[PDB]
Structures are given as C-alpha cells and as structure tokens.
C-alpha cells in the first residue's frame, strides 16, 4: 500500500549523460552509441540568440570547437549536424553503457521521468507530465539544458523530452529527441509565454481509482452521470473533455475496482462542485492530474524493469 | 524555477540489487563488495513468524539453503551471519558495480530516496522522510522487502533504510543497514501500530523558504516571534518543537532570502492559526514537511 509520485529508475539514463561545451556555452548532452544529442543553442552567444540563423552559425563551427566530456574523459568529435533544434555530435567512441532505447514524441497528458543534470552530472530525478499547453511544471536551474525526460518499458528507454528553456511563469519548454519543440516555442530570444492550461481529466480519474485501490473511498458516489452531463461540468472547471477513448483507457482500473467509469465521473463532478470539505485523497488536498491510468496500474501491480 | 519532490539518481543502487531466496520466501538483497544484505525474515515460514527465535532458526540453515540471483547469475553463498534484523550473506564474487558507500542511521525528519524493487529488479524511485513516529509514507507491495533508502553526496551512497513491513494504516517500517529497526517495531507476526505522528517543523520552514526563493511571498507578514512563543503555538497544532539547532540549520536559507528565521516562524504561526484560506504554496494546499533545509538548498541552488 501507499501511493507516491514515482519516477522510473534513472540508472540507464545516468550512463548516457555528458557535458558539451562550445566556446563559452556549456550544457548537457545525451550520449547514445556514437552520437551525442544536445540543444543546438550550445553554438550561440547572447548576441546570436536575438535572431539566430543556426545553419549559418553551425557552418562556422568545426569538430574541434565542441568539447564533450564523459566523466573525466574527453570524447573526440568527428562529425556534427543539426536536426531541427538539436545538435548531433558524432564521436569516435560508442557509449558502452548505451541502453536499448527509442525516441518517441509524446501527447499532452502523458507523464515521464526527468533526470536533472548540471555539467553532465545527474543531480536528481522527478516525475512530470506534458501539460495540455505543452509546457512542463519542472524544476530546472540555469545549466540544466540538455537534461532529458523518459519512460522505461521492461529494458527499453523511450526518450521523449530534452530541456531547452523556462517561460515567465516558471514552467518549462523543450523538444523531443529529434529537436521538435512541444508547443509553439522557438529557440530564439523573443517574447514567449505559456498558454492557458487545463486539467488532465483522464489522469484525475486514474488517481481517484488509485485512491480506491488504496482504501480511500469516502468520495465515491453511485449517481452515474452521462459523458455529456459530465463534460458540461468539466468545461466549467477548466477540465479537458473526456472522450470514449479515455473511458476505454480507464477500462482495466474500472474492472479491477468494480466502479464504472461514469460512476467515478459522478464522484469527480461532486468533488469539483463541493470541494473536498477538509478531507484528503491519498494525502492530497487538491485533485492530482499527473498520474496516467498506466502509471496507476504499474505502481499498484509492481511492474519492474530490466 | 519550479519545486518538485526530487529523488537522488538511483543508478548506483540499481547496480546492487539482487534476489534472495530461502525455502519458499523470496525478497530483495543489497550486494556490496562480497556481501549481500537482506531482511533476516527471509529464513522464516509463516509458522516461524508467530514467535521466531532467529538464532535458533538460523543455526538450522546452511550456506546452500540461500539462493542469491544477480540478473540471471547465481552467486555462491560461502558464509552467513545475522546482525540485528539483517542477514549478511558472504558470496564468492565482489559486486563490480559497488559504489563508494557507507551505512548511516538517520534521525526523524531526515529525507531519503527509496528504490522500490521486486524479485531483485528496480520498479521505481521516490523520496520520503523518516516520520517522527519512525514510519515512512512509502509505496510498497508484497515482495518489496529488502528495498533500500539512501542519500548521495558527490559519489558516495549513504544507505539509511531497508524495508521490512507495512502497518495497519498503510505506512511502512524497516531498519538501518545494520538491521536495527526505526521505532519500536519487531520482525514478528504480532499486533503493531504506528503511533500518533507530528509535523516536522524545521522542514515546513525550509519549504516556506523554497517558496520565497521561487518568488512567492503571499504568506509573509510584518511580525516576528520568540522561539518559546512559537513553540507554544506549534505544540497546539501537533508540530515538533523547533530548537536553536534547527534555527542555525536554517541560517543559509535565511541569509539567501533576507528573512530572519523567527520572522518566517511568525509567518508559519499565522498560517497555522488562520489557514491558507484556499491559497496554495508551491502548488500545495497543505504545508509540506518532507523537504529538509539541505534538500531546499540542493534543489533551489546550484
């Protein structure tokens, strides 16, 4: 029992973290096989960031302008190319600790672990979600660029996020591992802001199932709402619409607890309208939306990794 | 910016996790150099747990009664001893992934990372605190015994917890890496319960400093308090006494924010008396007490 915000074990990723320096700019890189991945703004000065032509700026760099450090070893850069907003540095040595991996672009509402790094050295691990507005509520200081987000299935690391920037509200924006930003953000020094966000309804429902699984049932009510009636109330509280696809996804948790998805919707509706009334759910005084249905099942069933 | 419940990177610990089996009982072990550490109840059947004499039970075992598996490789047990509530199995192979490590017994209020494991395989990592009642609010299913708690400083792993058991309220109890339980708990099947818990005052103050560092001041006020007056109010809300040592420990955060410790105490006092009134602090509607002053400095600075 117990239910905690839980990250994937970070070991497989720790073995891939390096430091990348170009001129006066230093940040983190990800070393997989004979390639090191990092934010392309590593090649920029402050002047350049106002209106960078990255093609032009990169052409002005040689292999020897990049200093890549793994632990206490300098890796020899033998090639460089840009892919969208990430730089790829080909090195003469394949990382012997390379895990089985893939790169995946995730959807909003999906969660992942972040390994926060500074100077190529792992500092900490925490769990986050891609918000509906394509930011993440991370914890990152200057120097954290190139830290990555990931999931693990059995022995395979799916990298989904590379950190690039912070927005005025203190939330974070970045790319997939192929350098495409999540959301409309750009790697140029120009005014940028997070859009209005919404609550990830399917995840709140998942967390309510987690609560039931852990013996926390005070909020249950069996006045089964309809999807339409529910979404009317959701709209009002700035919750994402719940689709039939979300209902299907909640199937296993519904079956495990014997509580119909639309009954849990009825409970959530009541929670939104009346609040928690001084009570907590899984130790929280607010409705939590950064556990997916998958996360709940994994944590409640004891799934492990190789 | 941002503030998250944050764990240490778990790689150094992952490389130490093994599966230990005796008879019908399987749990996790920690493999450091040529020794594997695990809960001594690995040697028990359910009958034995009612009133175990572990000295008597262990003397009935041989080295070959213990099956240790690292990955898909069987380690040969060549010795065994009991130390308090942990079993130590000497194996013929030193773990090549052994990090620099020490064993430390922590105080209530201190935080650590937990690497939850099943069948010697890592499942997840999370951060928790040793509660004043010497339990932890973890997430553990049957099979998680032998999972460990730890801190990391530069390259050195300080192991502070091995998991043994769950209490009726769903909280968790265990030992240090030398097998001494935190709290009054015993590794016998008999009625046990968590005592009434208290809030870790020094940590709440630390987290309020975290909030200020990240740009939130709404809960501050113009008042100060004395340590004595503050503790009078704390007592009433089931908060731990704040000592001068705690005040000294909060020094760096005080200096960084320019808010005197006793001024933040005045803010906390007001928060306890009036509540938050539907406002949040760092995304929380409750006062959070599982970040130490060191955790705040580590995460907010560097």
């Amino acid at each position: 029992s117990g239910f905690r915000k839980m990250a994937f074990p970070s070991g497989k990723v720790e073995g891939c973290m390096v430091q990348v320096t170009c001129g006066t700019t230093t940040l983190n890189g990800l070393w997989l096989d004979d390639v090191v991945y990092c934010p392309r703004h590593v090649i920029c000065t402050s002047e350049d960031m106002l209106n960078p032509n990255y093609e032009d700026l990169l052409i002005r760099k040689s292999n020897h302008n990049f200093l890549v450090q793994a632990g206490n070893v300098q890796l020899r850069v033998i090639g460089h190319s840009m892919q969208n907003c990430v730089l790829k540095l080909k090195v003469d040595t394949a990382n012997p600790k390379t895990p089985k991996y893939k790169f995946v672009r995730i959807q909003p509402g999906q969660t992942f672990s972040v390994l926060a790094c500074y100077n190529g050295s792992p500092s900490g691990v925490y769990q986050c979600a891609m918000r509906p507005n394509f930011t993440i509520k991370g914890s990152f200081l200057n120097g954290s660029c190139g830290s990555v987000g990931f999931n693990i299935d059995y022995d395979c690391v799916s990298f989904c996020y590379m950190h690039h920037m912070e927005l005025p509200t203190g939330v974070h924006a970045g790319t997939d591992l192929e350098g495409n930003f999540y959301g409309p953000f750009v790697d140029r020094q120009t005014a940028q802001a997070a859009g209005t966000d919404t609550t990830i309804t399917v995840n709140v429902l998942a967390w309510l199932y987690a609560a039931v699984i852990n013996g926390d049932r005070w909020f249950l009510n069996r006045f089964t709402t309809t999807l339409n009636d529910f979404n009317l109330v959701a709209m009002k509280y700035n919750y994402e619409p719940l689709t039939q696809d979300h209902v299907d996804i909640l199937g296993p948790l519904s079956a495990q607890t014997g509580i119909a998805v639309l009954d849990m919707c009825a409970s959530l509706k009541e929670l939104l309208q009346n609040g928690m009334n001084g009570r907590t759910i899984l130790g929280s005084a607010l409705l939590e939306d950064e556990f997916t249905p998958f996360d709940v099942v994994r944590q409640c069933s004891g799934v492990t990794f190789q | 910016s941002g503030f998250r419940k944050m764990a240490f990177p778990s790689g150094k610990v992952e490389g130490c996790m093994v599966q230990v089996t005796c008879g019908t009982t399987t749990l996790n072990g920690l493999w450091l150099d040529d020794v594997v550490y695990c809960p001594r109840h690995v040697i028990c059947t359910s009958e034995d747990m009612l009133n175990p004499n572990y000295e008597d039970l262990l003397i009935r075992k041989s080295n070959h009664n213990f099956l240790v598996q690292a990955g898909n490789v069987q380690l040969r047990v060549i010795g065994h001893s009991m130390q308090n509530c942990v079993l130590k199995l000497k194996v013929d192979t030193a773990n090549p992934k052994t990090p620099k490590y020490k064993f430390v017994r922590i105080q209530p209020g201190q935080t650590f990372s937990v690497l939850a494991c099943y069948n010697g395989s890592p499942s997840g990592v999370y951060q928790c605190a040793m509660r004043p009642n010497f339990t932890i609010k973890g997430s553990f299913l049957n099979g998680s015994c032998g999972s460990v708690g730890f801190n990391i400083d530069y390259d050195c792993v300080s192991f502070c917890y091995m998991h043994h058991m769950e209490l009726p309220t769903g909280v968790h109890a265990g030992t240090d890496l030398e097998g001494n339980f935190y709290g009054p708990f015993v590794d016998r099947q008999t009625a046990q319960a968590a005592g009434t818990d208290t809030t870790i005052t020094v940590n709440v103050l630390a987290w309020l400093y975290a909030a200020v560092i990240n740009g939130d001041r709404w809960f501050l006020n113009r008042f100060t308090t004395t340590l004595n007056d503050f503790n009078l109010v704390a007592m009433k809300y089931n908060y731990e006494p704040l000592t001068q040592d705690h005040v000294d420990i909060l020094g760096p955060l005080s200096a960084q924010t320019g808010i005197a410790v006793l001024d933040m105490c005045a803010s906390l006092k007001e928060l306890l008396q009036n509540g938050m009134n539907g406002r949040t602090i760092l995304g929380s509607a409750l006062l959070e007490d599982e970040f130490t002053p060191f955790d705040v400095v580590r995460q907010c600075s560097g």
Binding site: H164, G170, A191 | G215
Partner: peptide
C-alpha cells in the same frame, strides 16, 4: 529564457 550561463536567462522573463 534558455537554461544554457551567459545566454541571458532571467527568472520571470
């Protein structure tokens, strides 16, 4: 702004 020392990151934007 960007979380890489001299590229002008300012808390709050």
């Amino acid at each position: 702004x960007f979380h890489x020392l001299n590229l002008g990151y300012r808390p709050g934007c």
